[PDB]
Design a protein around this nucleic acid. Sequence first.
DNA 1: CCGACAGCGCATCAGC
DNA 2: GCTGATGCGT
DNA 3: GTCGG
Length: 328
Amino acid sequence: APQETLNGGITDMLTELANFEKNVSQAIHKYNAYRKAASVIAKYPHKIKSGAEAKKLPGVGTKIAEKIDEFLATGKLRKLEKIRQDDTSSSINFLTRVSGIGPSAARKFVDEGIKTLEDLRKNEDKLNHHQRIGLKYFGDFEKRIPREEMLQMQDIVLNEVKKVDSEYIATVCGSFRRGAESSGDMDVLLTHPSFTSESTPKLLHQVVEQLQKVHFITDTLSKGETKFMGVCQLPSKNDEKEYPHRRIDIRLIPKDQYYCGVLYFTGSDIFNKNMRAHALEKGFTINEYTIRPLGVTGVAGEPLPVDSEKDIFDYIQWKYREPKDRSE
DNA sequence: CCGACAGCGCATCAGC
DNA sequence: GCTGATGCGT
DNA sequence: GTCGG
Ligand code: NA
Ligand code: NA
Ligand code: NA
Ligand code: NA
């Protein structure tokens, strides 16, 4: 984990470029090209001396090497300095920090003179339900969640889920499950023996309802038969500053696909890419839902029975690795 | 050169 | 009213 | 923007 002082000027520049590609130019693949470059540079354990040096890293190409040369010689990038000053571009970029405001909504708002949170506050009728919640909790949603709060949040979720029906199985996944010291949100995977891919939904609703009844879930961004996305808040101790509101997702998953889901949503994203690779060369295709054998002509067969995460590792003769070990 | 860069749930729009 | 497309988040 | 068939 090299100190940011090493190439933090370069990685900051590439991340800022990334955001403008995503939010203003609506070029998601360039956004991800810049993010990939910033990640591989963020890991490089040497102070970069030239664009040509950076070009040797996978994901750094001709144009980024060129930008790195300009940044190293001048300490800035003319194109980035210009767009930073640009009133419509900076406002569009900023507004997309509201959950529910994407590039299209942010463009439309700025087009009609709505540029700041104050302007959004003044124009509630122009916001959909998701966007009102994102505005309401703009600051809270940008805070991280310390692991101790994630533990208290997990206590409530597991308790109330079991209270609804002790046969529910709930797992808090994400980097939290891998042991991380902070989280961006809470990702809950839910199943029940009565729910399989084949037959028979109110199983999700009952859990959301009970978490609302004990005043843990405070708002709903979206809710269907298999996926809930919303907002929650820990109760504050008597006479004490209140905890920030937090994003929580709850997904209902058929029992026979549950452990593929836990594996995938535990990650990390790098670990998943490797395991999928190792699965292919072993003759298996793994997605979020299933693991399947591949015949010699590539024809995917029926999904294989999975009753634990280890079942998946066993199929591809990989030793089971702890969530804390799944960084890569 | 030029296509891939993941797939999907839900809310909402666009078209009929 | 319905069906498929789009925006969005992930 | 970068990679690679
Ligand atoms: Na490169
Ligand atoms: Na955003
Ligand atoms: Na947004
Ligand atoms: Na019971």
